[PDB]
Amino acid sequence: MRMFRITACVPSQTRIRTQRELQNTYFTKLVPYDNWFREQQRIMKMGGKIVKVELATGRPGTNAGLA
Amino acid sequence: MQDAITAVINSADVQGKYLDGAAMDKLKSYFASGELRVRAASVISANAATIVKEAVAKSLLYSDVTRPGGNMYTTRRYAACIRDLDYYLRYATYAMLAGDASILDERVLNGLKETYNSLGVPISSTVQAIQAIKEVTASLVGADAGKEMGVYLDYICSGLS
Amino acid sequence: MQDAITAVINSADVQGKYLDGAAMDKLKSYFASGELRVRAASVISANAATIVKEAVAKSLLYSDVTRPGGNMYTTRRYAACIRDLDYYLRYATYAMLAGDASILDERVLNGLKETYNSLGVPISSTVQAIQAIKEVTASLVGADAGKEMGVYLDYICSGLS
Amino acid sequence: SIVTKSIVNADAEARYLSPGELDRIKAFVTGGAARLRIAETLTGSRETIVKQAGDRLFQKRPDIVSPGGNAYGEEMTATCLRDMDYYLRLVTYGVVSGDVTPIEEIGLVGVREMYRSLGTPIEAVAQSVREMKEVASGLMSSDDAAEASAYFDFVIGKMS
Amino acid sequence: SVVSQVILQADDQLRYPTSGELKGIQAFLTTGAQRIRIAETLAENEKKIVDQAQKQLFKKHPEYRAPGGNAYGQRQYNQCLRDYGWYLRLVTYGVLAGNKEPIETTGLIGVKEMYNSLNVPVPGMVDAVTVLKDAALGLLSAEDANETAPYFDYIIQFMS
Amino acid sequence: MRDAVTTLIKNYDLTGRYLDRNAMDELKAYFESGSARIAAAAMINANSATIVKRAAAQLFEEIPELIRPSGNAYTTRRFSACLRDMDYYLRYASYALIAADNNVLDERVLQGLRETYNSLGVPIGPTVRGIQIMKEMIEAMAEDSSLNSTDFIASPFDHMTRELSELSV
Amino acid sequence: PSQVAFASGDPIPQNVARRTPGPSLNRFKEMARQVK
Amino acid sequence: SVKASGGSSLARPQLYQTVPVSAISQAEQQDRFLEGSELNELTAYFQSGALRLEIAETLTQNADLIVSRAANRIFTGGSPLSYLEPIPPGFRPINIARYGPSNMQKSLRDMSWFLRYTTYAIVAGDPNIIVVNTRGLKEVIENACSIDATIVAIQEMRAASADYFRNNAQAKEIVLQYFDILLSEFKAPTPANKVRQGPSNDIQGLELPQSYFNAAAKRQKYAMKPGLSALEKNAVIKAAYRQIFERDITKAYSQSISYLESQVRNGDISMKEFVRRLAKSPLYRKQFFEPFINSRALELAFRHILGRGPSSREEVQKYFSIVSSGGLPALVDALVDSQEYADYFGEETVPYLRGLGVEAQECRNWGMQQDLFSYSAPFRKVPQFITTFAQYDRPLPDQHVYGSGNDPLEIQFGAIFPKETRNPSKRPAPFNKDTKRILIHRGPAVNNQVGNPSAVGEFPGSLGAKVFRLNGGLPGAGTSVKFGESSTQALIRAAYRQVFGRDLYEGQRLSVAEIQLENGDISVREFIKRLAKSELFLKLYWAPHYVCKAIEYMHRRLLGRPTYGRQEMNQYFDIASKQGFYAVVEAMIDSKEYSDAFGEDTVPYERYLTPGGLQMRSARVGSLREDIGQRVDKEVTPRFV
Ligand SMILES: *[C@@H](C)[C@H]1/C(=C/c2[nH]c(/C=C3N=C(/C=C4\NC(=O)C(CC)=C4C)C(C)=C\3CCC(=O)O)c(CCC(=O)O)c2C)NC(=O)[C@@H]1C
Ligand SMILES: *[C@@H](C)[C@H]1/C(=C/c2[nH]c(/C=C3N=C(/C=C4\NC(=O)C(CC)=C4C)C(C)=C\3CCC(=O)O)c(CCC(=O)O)c2C)NC(=O)[C@@H]1C
Ligand SMILES: *[C@@H](C)[C@H]1/C(=C/c2[nH]c(/C=C3N=C(/C=C4\NC(=O)C(CC)=C4C)C(C)=C\3CCC(=O)O)c(CCC(=O)O)c2C)NC(=O)[C@@H]1C
Ligand SMILES: *[C@H](C)[C@H]1/C(=C/c2[nH]c(/C=C3N=C(/C=C4\NC(=O)C(CC)=C4C)C(C)=C\3CCC(=O)O)c(CCC(=O)O)c2C)NC(=O)[C@@H]1C
Ligand SMILES: *[C@H](C)[C@H]1/C(=C/c2[nH]c(/C=C3N=C(/C=C4\NC(=O)C(CC)=C4C)C(C)=C\3CCC(=O)O)c(CCC(=O)O)c2C)NC(=O)[C@@H]1C
Ligand SMILES: *[C@H](C)[C@H]1/C(=C/c2[nH]c(/C=C3N=C(/C=C4\NC(=O)C(CC)=C4C)C(C)=C\3CCC(=O)O)c(CCC(=O)O)c2C)NC(=O)[C@@H]1C
Ligand SMILES: *[C@H](C)[C@H]1/C(=C/c2[nH]c(/C=C3N=C(/C=C4\NC(=O)C(CC)=C4C)C(C)=C\3CCC(=O)O)c(CCC(=O)O)c2C)NC(=O)[C@@H]1C
Ligand SMILES: *[C@H](C)[C@H]1/C(=C/c2[nH]c(/C=C3N=C(/C=C4\NC(=O)C(CC)=C4C)C(C)=C\3CCC(=O)O)c(CCC(=O)O)c2C)NC(=O)[C@@H]1C
Ligand SMILES: *[C@H](C)[C@H]1/C(=C/c2[nH]c(/C=C3N=C(/C=C4\NC(=O)C(CC)=C4C)C(C)=C\3CCC(=O)O)c(CCC(=O)O)c2C)NC(=O)[C@@H]1C
Ligand SMILES: *[C@H](C)[C@H]1/C(=C/c2[nH]c(/C=C3N=C(/C=C4\NC(=O)C(CC)=C4C)C(C)=C\3CCC(=O)O)c(CCC(=O)O)c2C)NC(=O)[C@@H]1C
Ligand SMILES: *[C@H](C)[C@H]1/C(=C/c2[nH]c(/C=C3N=C(/C=C4\NC(=O)C(CC)=C4C)C(C)=C\3CCC(=O)O)c(CCC(=O)O)c2C)NC(=O)[C@@H]1C
């Protein structure tokens, strides 16, 4: 499967949390290709700042043999 | 219940059409097989006790089912099981004579699973015993009449699964 | 779920017994019919939408069910009925391949009657729909596969009834 | 209610309302005004009715408010007057409905079992209702009093 | 009458009749003068009422008197006139009684069974009763006609 | 079964309340409407058979499939049963009109009605349309006659229509 | 002997016709007759 | 709307009688094989079948000509055949132009329909269809159709149909007899409806058209009389046992009360007294009283003694009071001595199941009586009439939208649902698409997201479940004794316990996902998604269940709450229809509410309960608080101390 490696910064609106929240804020994680559109929308519409997107696993221009 | 004539007539009537060629074909097949189906039913009725005895001997006796802790263990449970076998034979005969399994739907498979799942009767053992009944009847009535009864006994068996 | 092979294996394993000759011949029976089941399943998989369409068109269209006030009125409910029919056809094919109705009893029928009585889905009309599916499939896959698919569609109907 | 009785009778016979049932419903509808007047009187005078009836009951039946009696003590006496208020409310319900059905349904089915469970002498409850009937009858005209006394008497008869 | 109905309802529950049932009994027993005068007025005018009704019906259904018809023949025609009169008598009975019981026990229960056995069409009978209703109410005051119409309506409803 | 007075009394007994001014006003409204309700019931009694027949005829004219093969009014058996059901609805609607309360319809008509029609394959929608046809006929009849109050007439029929019909929105 | 086979015999498919617009579409049918 | 459902099962009234159905039902209602009588009827009918099909063929082929002869004799002034879809004194031909196109269409349709149903009756070997659909057609069409004209048309059709059968007195006689039945039945007046009056004021009165009764299967009626032969008395007693005990326990188990049978067959006791004493017997007590609570026992007793289920709330109330007071003897005496019993069965007739086709049926107890009449009724232990009748009078219950069976136990692990067939307990209720289920928050009540939608994610503290978060850093984000190994592993095992309920056996854990989580490559959300989509989850919790049961359990595990109603259920179920299990999991974990309640670092947890689950947990003796549901009296030392 294609896997992106997305880096994002998520700010905190509507709440001043007192527990540890740094892990949720600026995170780098592997995302399956199929979920990246939905995840991009979710991070954006939450107020996030997607710094970086790369194709960690997979190739461009691949018509077959992606799963 | 509905027999074959009712099924054909209702199919014709719901469309407002007279009895057509295919309807007449199926009806004449029913009427032509009727005499041999009646003879098979008579033979089965004359041998119901022996049929159930032999099927029980083949499939159920001398197994975990009849020993202490088995669902057929006590005398009441044994008698109830052979009575159920008689039910299955009788209603297979009804379905054969009617040329349709509607009697099995409305008078047998209605809450058969309710009854057996509530009482914890073993379904696999029942299916094995019904298969034994089918084999015994086929040996007694003939291969072709055996198949004619076997469609309905298999119908009950698949209803049990 | 259990298929015919798993039915034999479970019957042997609950007693701790290796497979004897009778179990072997039951497995031989299942292997004998497996080609038929694969071909019938292929035809039905190719034509599923068309069986459903023709069965709806022959049983439910231009009736009170689709007119204003019927349970198939409005597009959401129409799509719901077609969706249910897709499930019934697909699970009937699954069971037919397996040779056992167990998947129907567990995925389809265990809760569906309560579901339909809760939602107010009419069971007479849906049984008519599944019967129409039965005849359409019987027309497509032939005599033997038609009867085998029959068995499991009738099973769904009896579970609903 | 009278209307409900007529309707359920007609339904039991699987027929439309007969002329007699329509006549009875017409009588009920026409007597609505007087029934409402009686109910208005009973509701408006509920406090004085209950106080006077309870006074007459206690002075006539001191044992129930004497030590060892069921209604002994300030709180038990308060609860007894509360029960009297309950039954007066039910009487007003029966008056407006034109029938004893609400009284039966709310306050007389199983009343014996309840009061046996509580240890309350039921005959004294009947006497409390009698006192309430006597007090209420003085507050209205003779025909109105006669109409209300029937509901009071139904309660009394069910009590004892 | 309503008294018998009240007693039947009370006995079925093994109790004395409630206050509402007795009040209905009182209202019925007070309207007796109107019921009696209606019964008398319908009594002496039987001939005119029946004549108007029968001419109206056989204008509505000339086939009944036509050859092959149920009323064709003087005997059958006279029997039909007899039936008109008998049902008017039943209506007077019902008016006096205050309910439909005298009508229903005498000439409605099994009426379809009877007339089917005689090949007199039941729809012919309901049309006959409708015209008899019109003729009879024509000979009554407005209030008396309003009082006595629902009995004719009840016979009509039972007939079909 | 609950009529308007019983419904009011139940509401007030739930809270242990004596009847107040609003209760007396509602009872007064029912009692003053009683004469009109009785007149409407009597008019229905005078025309029930013809009302049912004409409503059925109109329904089968509006939905001709009902009396054609595979229609649920097809064959005299089903046709007679359908006219019987219409008679049921009219009789219980008359009851509800007199009681000024639709609980009689809930208890003795609607509860389990969907289940029965689903079991038999009786189509609900045409039955609801027939109920509405009978309602319109009753309303026109009441308008024609010398009746003063006729707004209550629609209440039972509409109730049945809302209680039995499928939810579309 | 083989004549006994009815349910075990070769199935005889029955003709069931696809349903078509009933009289409830009559007005639209007229409109269809006047849309060409 | 209606607040409860008694269930709905497929109903199959008989439309008409046929010879095989007649014979087979005659044998089957008596619980026996077909004997010489029924088998001989079947033989004769099958023999006549070829001739009957010949008649049907010739009539369907020439139906056009027969109908044309009828239409030409009946109509005058035009061609009736322009559109196809002995003489009474009053007969006169009808004018096509005057009579009208609609009525002409109905005339031609009716003639063809008469011929068609005549052929149907010929094939069926019974005129019952003709009688059923023709007795009372006259009154249906008098006012728009001439009866004399119809009679003449039927006579012409009869003559033309019989004209094709000069063969011999085999075809001609059958055709003539069936047409004569049609003629006499069209000439028949409408019979009165069968009235089933309410036995009391709590039960409505009903009526049934006689044609409906004529079509339905006739209930065999057994009456004990002194003069019956011994074999007939045996049949009657067997019927009594089949009615009271639901099957022939004498045939099955040799169970019998001999002295009662001798008394009833001698006439010492009536069949009513025999029923009374049999239903009081220890046999009946052991079979249909001891196994059941009184509430279910009285419903079964109504089946056995009256042939019907309870009709109303008042009736079940009254009879439950009776059985509470005097037990089984009081119940049996009340039922047998009821006016209803004597009205139907009297002194001699064995009670019979009434049900559909025998008399007008009520809607209020339709489904419950359908269930009660099944032979599986003894295995329903939960009362069905009191429950459904009470639920009519009350708002919608706390229950899954698709039924009670779709509610799993709210236990730590396991997907335990009631099985529809095992000890049937189904409680259908009409939830429309917009209902919302009231859920109890596991935490501060005011944090329930219904009243406080921004409370979503507010951890419940001591009032709710423990919450596992990857708050601490992950290891290696060399050295040993790095403390960040215990927290991450505790969270991994917590996630396993959340998705699956309990920890897996050795070799089952998704080790690759665990290392990929421990290396910061994924988030907690991604890991639980992998767990939920695992083949192990599919096999355990998706595959073995009804689709909506699987979805409901999934929702509880992943979102920490049951579904609110039809909106969520329908969307997940539709995804299940279209895409499948992995897509359903995706939808649940990618939903907005998951993000709000659980971020990328929180293991899901139980956030809400149904009332039933909370009651299960907190209503037991050892967990029930002292102040809940009772009066708490303050204890004070006596003043005299
Ligand atoms: C000597 C005692 C007589 C005799 C006996 C006999 N019995 C069988 C077979 C069975 N007997 C039973 C009986 C019971 N099982 C129970 O659970 C109970 C109650 C505790 C009883 C009484 C059963 C169930 C069987 C079936 C065998 C099995 O265990 O599965 C046989 C064999 C008959 C045959 O042909 O197989 C015999 C010989 N036979 C006589 O002639 C003696 C008078
Ligand atoms: C042998 C077949 C298996 C077996 C049977 C068994 N059955 C029961 C009990 C009952 N079986 C039924 C079934 C029916 N009754 C009907 O009227 C019909 C429709 C035609 C059917 C299918 C019923 C209702 C009962 C209980 C009530 C009754 O007696 O009728 C038992 C007894 C169970 C108990 O624990 O008491 C048994 C033993 N058991 C096996 O192990 C065999 C595989
Ligand atoms: C045609 C088949 C008939 C018909 C169908 C119909 N069904 C619904 C709604 C639902 N059907 C289901 C079905 C299932 N649940 C399961 O778990 C399974 C899998 C084994 C099945 C088959 C469900 C869950 C629903 C409810 C969905 C929802 O939440 O909305 C409808 C719509 C009913 C409504 O009120 O929207 C319809 C129309 N109806 C007919 O009249 C046909 C005879
Ligand atoms: C205060 C002296 C200065 C200042 C602060 C400021 N901080 C933020 C936002 C965040 N700060 C953190 C830091 C931490 N969170 C943790 O959990 C820990 C580790 C234990 C640390 C050190 C984080 C993660 C954020 C973002 C997420 C969140 O706030 O919940 C802001 C930005 C506010 C905003 O919403 O844009 C500010 C203002 N700013 C100054 O000017 C001061 C000099
Ligand atoms: C016209 C613009 C297009 C077209 C139409 C067409 N429709 C059908 C058949 C049906 N149409 C519906 C639609 C609805 N039913 C509803 O309840 C609603 C919601 C309010 C709608 C819109 C249905 C259900 C049917 C099925 C038949 C029935 O009513 O029972 C047809 C006939 C299809 C067939 O073969 O039966 C046609 C022709 N066709 C076009 O080409 C246009 C684009
Ligand atoms: C009159 C000379 C001719 C005629 C016309 C006619 N029929 C109707 C109405 C109905 N006809 C039927 C018929 C049948 N019901 C059945 O079950 C069968 C098989 C035995 C038949 C043939 C029915 C059910 C109706 C009522 C519903 C409907 O309109 O279809 C009318 C209209 C009556 C009206 O009052 O509007 C007319 C004019 N029928 C004859 O037999 C004559 C040849
Ligand atoms: C006429 C507008 C529609 C129609 C009707 C139809 N109904 C039935 C059968 C039954 N109808 C009922 C209904 C009730 N029973 C009650 O007690 C009450 C409450 C007061 C109601 C509303 C019932 C229970 C039945 C079955 C039992 C019986 O016949 O008494 C039929 C016959 C169904 C069949 O073929 O078996 C018909 C035709 N049909 C239409 O097409 C109209 C929409
Ligand atoms: C045997 C010594 C003689 C004999 C007996 C005989 N009796 C009957 C019939 C009946 N016997 C009774 C008696 C009782 N039934 C009871 O329940 C009890 C009370 C505990 C008693 C004493 C009855 C009531 C009958 C009639 C009903 C029945 O058959 O059970 C018969 C049969 C008569 C018949 O015509 O069928 C016989 C043969 N007959 C002799 O010849 C012996 C001298
Ligand atoms: C008392 C401590 C609590 C209480 C009780 C209560 N119960 C009812 C009504 C019923 N209770 C039953 C019970 C049973 N059915 C059985 O078969 C058995 C097993 C032996 C039992 C115990 C039934 C069937 C009813 C319904 C009776 C009826 O039909 O009316 C009520 C009245 C409910 C009503 O609506 O009338 C009450 C009050 N209630 C409390 O608040 C106490 C905590
Ligand atoms: C051991 C002494 C006996 C035994 C046990 C046994 N249990 C199961 C299956 C399950 N056990 C549970 C139990 C619980 N779930 C909870 O939430 C709680 C509290 C924390 C308990 C105690 C559940 C829910 C199941 C089913 C789900 C699951 O197993 O994960 C089995 C296996 C049954 C099967 O095949 O499903 C067994 C064997 N069996 C015996 O014979 C001993 C007497
Ligand atoms: C106040 C007049 C009385 C009272 C109330 C009380 N309620 C609770 C707890 C809950 N209340 C609800 C109710 C609803 N939730 C909904 O969504 C709706 C529909 C709009 C309603 C009506 C619920 C679900 C709860 C459970 C917690 C939660 O909110 O999720 C309590 C607390 C009970 C406890 O033990 O904590 C109380 C006190 N109590 C009284 O004594 C008053 C008479």
Rounded to whole angstroms, the Cα distance separating A41 from A39 reads 5
For residue A5, the cross-strand partners are A30
Q: B159 to chain C: which residues are within 8 Å by CB?
A: 101, 155, 158
Residue H108 and residue H153 in contact, taking contact as beta carbons nearer than 8 Å: no
Residue A7: its H or E element: strand A3-9
Question: What's the gap between Cα H480 and its chain centre?
Answer: 67
The alpha-helical segments, DSSP class H, found in B15-62 are 21-46, 48-59
SS3 category, H508: coil
E150–F48 CB contact, under 8 Å: no
- What are the φ/ψ torsions at residue H76 (nearest 5 degrees)? -135, 150
Contact state of C63 with F124 under an 8 Å Cβ cutoff = no
What proportions of chain B, in percent to the nearest 5, are helix, strand and coil? Answer: 75, 0, 25
Specify the residue for token string 């003894």.
H378
- Evaluate whether H275 touches H240 at the Cβ level (below 8 Å): yes
Read off the amino acid at residue H533: K
In the structure encoding, which two tokens stand for residue H343, read together?
Answer: 């009205």
Is the Cα torsion angle B29, B30, B36, B40 positive or negative in sign? positive
User: How many separate helices (H) and strands (E) can be counted in chain C?
Assistant: 7, 0
Q: Rounded to whole angstroms, how far apart are CA atoms D51 and D55?
A: 6
Instruction: Name the residue of B63, B77, B78, B81 to mutate for ligand 1: max ligand atoms within 8 A of Cβ.
Output: B78
Name the amino acid, one letter, at C119.
L
Atom 22, ligand 11: which residue's CA is nearest? H438
For chains F and H, tell me whether 3 or more CB atom pairs sit within 8 A of each other: yes
> Is the shortest distance between the CB of H412 and ligand 10 below 6 Å?
yes
Ligand 3 contact, C92 CB (< 6 A) = no
Residues paired with residue H195 on neighbouring β-strands, in sequence order: H207
Please state the residue numbers annotated as binding site of C for (2R,3E)-phycocyanobilin.
81
Q: With contact defined as beta carbons under 8 Å apart, do H436 and H564 qualify?
A: yes
Which positions in chain B touch C113 (Cβ < 8 Å)? none
3-class SS letters over H173-188: HHHHHHHHHHHHHHCC
Chains F and B touch (3+ CB pairs under 8 A): yes
Q: Dihedral through CA A44, CA A49, CA A55, CA A60, nearest 10? A: 60
H74 touches H153 (CB < 8 A)? yes
Q: If you measure from the C-alpha of residue F85 to the centroid of ligand 7, how many angstroms do you get, rounded to a whole number?
A: 5
How many angstroms separate the CA atoms of D1 and D15, rounded?
Answer: 20
The distance of Cα H307 from the centroid of its chain, to the nearest Å, equals 18
Q: Is any atom of ligand 3 closer than 6 Å to the C-beta of C101?
A: no
CATH classification at residue C13:
1.10.490.20
> Given its phi and psi angles, is residue D33 left (phi above 0), alpha (psi -120 to 50 degrees) or beta?
alpha
Joined together, the tokens standing for residue H498 give: 């959340």
Nearest to G13 by CA among B13, C89, B33, B25: B25
| 8 Å CB contact between H307 and H344 | yes
Distance from CA of H609 to the nearest CA of A (A): 27
User: Taking Cα atoms as reference points, which of F91, F76, F82 lies closest to residue F123?
Assistant: F82
Give the bridge partners for H223, in sequence order: H349
Inter-chain Cβ pairs, chain B and chain C, closer than 8 A: 31
Length of chain B: 161
CA distance H505 to H587: 28
Cβ separation of F124 and C70 shorter than 8 Å? yes
Residue A50 CA to its chain's centroid (Å): 7
Both tokens of residue H67?
A: 């109908």
Q: Which domain holds residue B100?
A: 1-161
Residue nearest to atom 9 of ligand 3 (CA): C80
Amino acid at D67: P
Burial class (CB in 10 A: 0-12, 13-18, 19+), H394: exposed
Look up residue H207 and give its DSSP letter: E
Q: Which residues of H582-602 are buried (b: 16+ CB within 10 A; e: fewer)?
A: eebbbbbbbbebbbebbbbbb
Report the alpha-carbon angle H617-H621-H625, nearest 5: 75
- Which 3 state secondary structure label does DSSP give C120? coil
The alpha carbon of residue E98 is apart from the nearest alpha carbon of chain D, in Å, by: 6
Nearest to H370 by CA among H385, H352, H387: H385
Environment class of residue D87 by beta-carbon count within 10 Å: exposed (0-12), middle (13-18) or buried (19+)? buried
User: Shortest CA distance to D152 belongs to which of D77, D105, D80, D94?
Assistant: D94
Least Cα separation, residue F46 to chain E (angstroms): 5
Cα(G6)–Cα(G9) distance, rounded to whole angstroms? 5
**Residue D142 is encoded by which pair of tokens?**
């003779």
* Residues in contact with H307: Cβ distance below 8 Å, sequence separation at least 6, in sequence order: H243, H344, H351, H352, H353, H354, H355
Chain E contacts of H191, Cβ < 8 Å? Answer: 112, 116
Q: Which two tokens stand for residue A33?
A: 């290709």
Q: Nearest-CA residue of chain B relative to C105? A: B161
**C37: nearest Cα among C136, C132, C146, C133:** C146
**Rounded Cα gap, residues H391 and H29, in angstroms:** 35
For the purposes of burial, counting CB atoms within 10 Å of the CB of C1, is it exposed (0-12), middle (13-18) or buried (19 or more)? middle
For tokens 């209703």, what's the residue?
A: E133
Would you say H262 and H295 are in contact if contact means Cβ atoms under 8 Å apart? no
Nearest CA-CA partner of H562 in H548, H575, H574, H576: H548
User: Closest-CA residue in chain H for E60?
Assistant: H143
Question: If you search the block for the tokens 């099944």, which residue do you land on?
Answer: H374
CA distance H32 to B86: 10
- Nearest partner of H440 among H478, H473, H499, H398, judged by Cα: H398
Helix (H, G, I), strand (E, B) or coil at H526: helix
Tokens representing residue D115 in the block = 């009061």
Is residue H142 within 8 Å of H118, Cβ to Cβ? no
Of the candidates H211, G2, H273, the one whose C-alpha atom is nearest the C-alpha of residue B37 is: G2
Contact (Cβ atoms closer than 8 angstroms) between residue D95 and residue D151: yes
Minimal CA separation from F53 to chain H, in Å: 10
Token pair for D94: 């029966």
Q: At which residue do the structure tokens 């008698």 appear?
A: B79
Residue labelled with tokens 């099995």:
B104
The CA distances from residue E63 to E113, H47, H148, H150, H189, in Å, are 22, 48, 11, 16, 16
Least Cα distance to H205 among H391, H420, H359, H37 occurs for H359
Strand H75-76 relative to strand A55-57: parallel, antiparallel, unpaired? unpaired
Point out the residue among C62, C122, C128 whose CB comes nearest to the CB of F118.
C122
Gap from B53 CA to chain G (nearest CA, Å): 26
Please give the annotated binding residues of D for (2R,3E)-phycocyanobilin, written as ranges: 80
Report the DSSP pairing between strands A3-9 and A49-52.
antiparallel
User: In this structure, are strands A49-52 and A26-32 parallel, antiparallel, or unpaired?
Assistant: unpaired
- The Cα E59–Cα H489 span in angstroms is 101
- CA torsion angle for B71, B72, B74, B80 (degrees, to 10)? 110
Who contacts H123 (Cβ-Cβ below 8 Å, separation ≥6)?
Answer: B5, B9, B19, B27, H52, H53, H56
Distance CA C110, CA C124 (A): 19
Residues making up chain A, counted from first to last: 67
Taking one residue from B and the other from H, the number of pairs with CB-CB distance under 8 angstroms is 142
Q: What is the DSSP string of D8-24?
A: HHHHHTTSPPPHHHHHH
By DSSP bridging, strand A3-9 and strand A55-57 are: antiparallel
- Number of domains chain B is built from: 1
CA angle F62, F64, F65 (to 5 degrees): 130
Distance CA F85, CA H360 (A): 11
Three-state SS across H411-444?
A: CCCCCCCCCCCCCCCCCCCCCCCCCCCCCEECCC
Task: Judge F/D contact: 3 or more CB pairs < 8 A.
Answer: yes
Residues with Cβ within 8 Å of residue C89, at least 6 apart in sequence: C44, C48, C51, C52, C133, C137
Interface chains of chain E (3 or more CB pairs under 8 Å): D, F, H
Residue whose entry in the numeric block shows the structure tokens 């309410």: H198
Note whether C153 contacts H: Cβ–Cβ < 8 A.
no
Give me the residue label for tokens 């804020």.
A25
B139 vs B156: CA distance, rounded Å: 20
DSSP assigned state of F106: I
CB H469 within 8 A of CB H488: no
Question: DSSP characters for F117-167?
Answer: HHHHT--HHHHHHHHHHHHHHHHHHHHHTT-S--STTHHHHHHHHHHHSPP
B78 neighbors H12 (Cβ within 8 angstroms): no
Q: Do F118 and C120 touch (CB under 8 A)?
A: yes
- Could you identify the residue written with the tokens 């009208």? H100
Q: Between the CA of residue H314 and those of G11, H88, H341, H367, what are the distances in Å? A: 54, 56, 18, 18
Cα H47 to chain center, whole Å? Answer: 40
**How far is it, in rounded angstroms, from Cα H603 to Cα H466?**
10
Distance C119 CA to ligand 3 centre (A): 7
Task: List the determination method.
Answer: cryo-EM
8 Å CB contact of D9 and E157:
no
Q: Minimal CA–CA distance to E107: which of E127, E123, E93?
A: E93
Q: Give the whole-angstrom CA distance, residue G4 versus residue F163.
A: 53
Strands H75-76 and H94-95, sheet pairing: parallel
CA proximity to H5, closest of H384, H457, H519, H527: H384
Nearest ligand 5 atom to the CA of C62 is: 30
* Nearest ligand to residue A48 Cα: 4
* Window 102-121 of F, Cβ < 8 Å to C: 114-115, 117-121
Using alpha carbons only, what angle is made at residue H575 by residues H572 and H580, rounded to the nearest 5 degrees? 110
Q: DSSP character for C108?
A: I
From the CA of B90, give the closest atom in ligand 2: 20
**CA nearest E158 in F: which residue?**
F49
